[PDB]
């Protein structure tokens, strides 16, 4: 009868246990090892300067209050057990509006090893800020960050470390590309310390390197502008007595350039500076007007 044995083990674990206190509170900094498995790298919204990402966010730490000895070495428990114990309060510094999935049940796993080691992983959709400098649009490249860390615990209480080699700790699935106008070149990680009025905090950082693909803007903007310039230049091979014909040519090409500029200014956010596409359209307009 493993039912009663294991129920007694769990009730022994949670008996006298205080989840308000971190493991090693009085005598040790809580070491939290983390890794990230990106299952999909969702779309990038340059209008909102943000990106989506779907992750298994994995954390692990030692808690000696949960040492057990029994017929198995690791308890693969339900997510409801996680609410009874202490877990780290990790949050994303540059995260805007993230979703923890609850369908069909909370997308969380907790595993307890007999020596008190805890593995706690959750499935998240993180939407995060990516401030983009669009001066070379549409031939620009960006490094979108993801920064996380504890909210309530300074570094003297809780530190974060990558669970594997830092270069192997954030892993992107080969099938998980929901990007349309970008390419994910790669990732880098780092670790550091921020300082606020409440103390010094460990912060873990990932940078995802993106390179915008130019095909949409060549098909939609550059080719129409180039052909409008060529049409403007066709007018030089008409008879000089065709004054209405060449007037039509000139004014219709100038108005087409204006239309194309107005419609191309909508692919971008409403930035306050000029981009490479803007300069190209300006020079094409100059040619047509000339």
């Amino acid at each position, epitope marked *: 009868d493993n039912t009663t044995v294991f129920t007694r083990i769990l009730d022994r674990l949670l008996d006298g246990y205080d989840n308000r206190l971190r493991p090693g509170l009085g005598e040790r900094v809580t070491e939290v090892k983390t890794d990230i498995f990106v299952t999909s790298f969702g779309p990038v919204s340059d209008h909102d300067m943000e990106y989506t990402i779907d992750v298994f966010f994995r954390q692990s730490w*030692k808690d000696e209050r949960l040492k057990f000895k029994g017929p198995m070495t690791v308890l693969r428990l339900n997510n409801l057990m996680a609410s009874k114990i202490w877990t780290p309060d990790t949050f994303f510094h540059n995260g805007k509006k993230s979703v923890a999935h609850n369908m069909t049940m909370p997308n969380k796993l907790l595993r307890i090893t007999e*020596d008190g*080691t805890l593995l706690y992983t959750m499935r998240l959709t993180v939407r995060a800020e990516c401030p983009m400098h669009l001066e070379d649009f549409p031939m620009d490249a960006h490094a979108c960050p993801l920064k996380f860390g504890s909210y309530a615990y300074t570094r003297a209480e809780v530190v974060y*470390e*990558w669970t594997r*080699e*830092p*270069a*192997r700790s954030v892993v992107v699935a080969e099938d998980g590309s929901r990007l349309n106008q970008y390419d994910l070149l790669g990732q*880098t*990680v*780092d*670790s*550091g310390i921020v300082q606020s009025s409440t103390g010094e905090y460990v912060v873990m950082t990932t940078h995802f390197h993106l390179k915008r693909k130019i095909g949409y803007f060549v098909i939609q903007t550059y080719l129409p502008c180039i052909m409008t310039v060529i049409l403007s230049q066709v007018s030089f091979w008409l008879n000089r007595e065709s004054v209405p014909a060449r007037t039509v040519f000139g004014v219709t090409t100038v108005l087409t350039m204006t239309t194309l500029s107005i419609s191309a200014r909508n692919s971008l956010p409403k930035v306050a500076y000029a981009t490479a596409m803007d300069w190209f359209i300006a020079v094409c307009y100059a040619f047509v007007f000339s």
Partner: antibody
Amino acid sequence: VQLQQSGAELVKPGASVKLSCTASGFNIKDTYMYWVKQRPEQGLEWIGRIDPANGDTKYDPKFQGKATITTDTFSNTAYLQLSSLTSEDTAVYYCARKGLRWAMDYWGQGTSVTVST
Amino acid sequence: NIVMTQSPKSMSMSVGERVTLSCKASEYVGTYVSWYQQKPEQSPKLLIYGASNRYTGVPDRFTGSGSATDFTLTIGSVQAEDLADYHCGQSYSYPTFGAGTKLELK
């Protein structure tokens, strides 16, 4: 807190050697164990690392097939066995553990093996 | 594999002056660079873990500074017991070390 390696070695070429590293003051499952080597009057060169919680090992592409790392989680020890050692395999072999920011904070004492006659 | 180029190969600092030792990496290593000190007949001791973090119990004269690919160890007051080689190593990927830097005393 403390790492203690095996005594110096005198291993004729062609044979296989096995060095040990006993830990005192921590459980090796809670960290990675690195084996480094150092030829006389040179720099350090990483041989391999092991995670004793799972037994998963990694080696420099230079020492793959030459060296093999194992652990004993009961005696709290790590083993580096150099199976097919040539004569050029004379160095001091250090045992270290991963530390604060993936730095090697605690080192062994160095088992200087000798390959001669 | 990330190559750590340490420089210079040899330095001879008189007692009391400032010294700067350089380390560069071929690839990105964010801040996972360590500086180790090795006296003769002894094993390396962790001086600096990460970029710019004095390991517990080392003299406060050693300081570290770093970048994605450039790192410096500075001894603000070179004393006499620094008759030791110094090593630089990255931990961003599988660890690799520099060639070493022997510090002498005129």
